[PDB]
């Protein structure tokens, strides 16, 4: 009951028109949408990374394959709900998720609470082991000019 | 033994006539970080980590860019009410990490004043406080000091 | 036994022609490599900077014109870290981190990184943990300009 590990997650997708902008589960009405094989929803991705890391086994790519009919067609809550089953196999109980947008538009306050309620379904945590935060990045660089949005995640789990 | 992790980014433009305060320092520099407030991009880290590892959301909901109440607001002050939120959820702090990422100027002269500003404002130890500070190996816009970026972890517990 | 802490780590080095790429411990082939007055092995700073900061002992570059480290390697300051960080009444209980890189593949590189870390660290493979991506070719990294590597360490003070 004492054997805590962390893990950290990072993603970042372009941003361009054509597409939705889908993140943490959430379809935000946008101009642009997010660039990626799959739905390209940073915030899960981040958070599924983090989830890997703390459980010591790998990484998002090294679980799934574009190439695995398993998971062709999945979305990254499909894919988030797949990590956390593995985390828990492995003997691993998640404890915590924080995590932080970077997007300098749209404005993500109106949809966090949906977010954080999909993540914490998807983990089968309360709520109030679930955060998400969100910020701009002052017009500086790449994700400033609109051009990205990048996602950072940080997990607390246990190995039970 | 119910521990709990944030995790904690801010960024902020560097600009001639402002004050440069980071950490809760003024330093001397002839540029100063723009913001609403005062625009301690590492206090703002650290108060997103402990809001984060909270669940209570973010600095953004509790103290906004757009209420007046903050414009030029002091950012120990909001750290200190952010400490004092995360202790009423039911919160104690066991350890704050970060990193300042500044072309400019030299840092290593004011850390250890950062560090004992943030250990007094979440009545921590100094040994439970720890802040780091570093270039960006001459890359992107913080290699060209158009802004300074800082970065955060806190660990708390509910007791 | 029950005095947690938790580091975090960031670094980023310049790709640049004439140099090995080297990172965590391990040199992969490619026509670049990173600069810096180390072997300037980006992950094992990130790593070492996670856990200065867990410790609370400062940063790698308080750490690190010292005739013992003059032309020290990267592996040789990250078992020096860990060091500290024991001297200082610390345990490590886990590390995870992030390769950012355009280029190359990172993928077969992996587990020997995993291998080297664990070994520097003397931890068993399975609390050590080294992930890899792209940066979707945004920025200074999305154009192979350099790497980055970012790093999460718990500790116990025991
Ligand atoms: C079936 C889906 O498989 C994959 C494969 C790689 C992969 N990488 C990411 S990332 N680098 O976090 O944007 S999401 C993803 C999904
Ligand atoms: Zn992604
Ligand atoms: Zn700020
Ligand atoms: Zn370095």
Do not use: W
Request: proline share 4%; aromatic share 4%; net charge negative.
């Amino acid at each position: 009951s004492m054997d805590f590990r962390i893990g950290q997650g990072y993603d970042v997708h372009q941003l361009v028109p054509g597409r939705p902008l889908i993140i943490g589960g959430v379809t935000i009405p946008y101009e642009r949408g997010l660039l990626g094989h799959s739905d390209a929803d940073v915030l899960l991705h981040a958070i599924t990374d983090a989830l890997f890391g703390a459980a010591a086994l790998g990484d998002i790519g090294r679980h799934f394959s574009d190439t695995d009919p398993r998971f062709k067609g999945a979305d990254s809550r499909a894919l988030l709900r797949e990590c956390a089953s593995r985390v828990a196999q492995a003997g691993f109980a998640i404890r915590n998720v924080d995590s932080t947008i970077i997007a300098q538009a749209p404005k993500l306050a109106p949809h966090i609470d949906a977010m954080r309620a999909n993540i914490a379904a998807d983990l089968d945590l309360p709520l109030d082991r679930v955060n998400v935060k969100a910020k701009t990045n002052e017009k500086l660089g790449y994700l400033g000019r609109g051009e990205g949005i990048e996602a950072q995640a940080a997990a607390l789990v246990v190995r039970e």
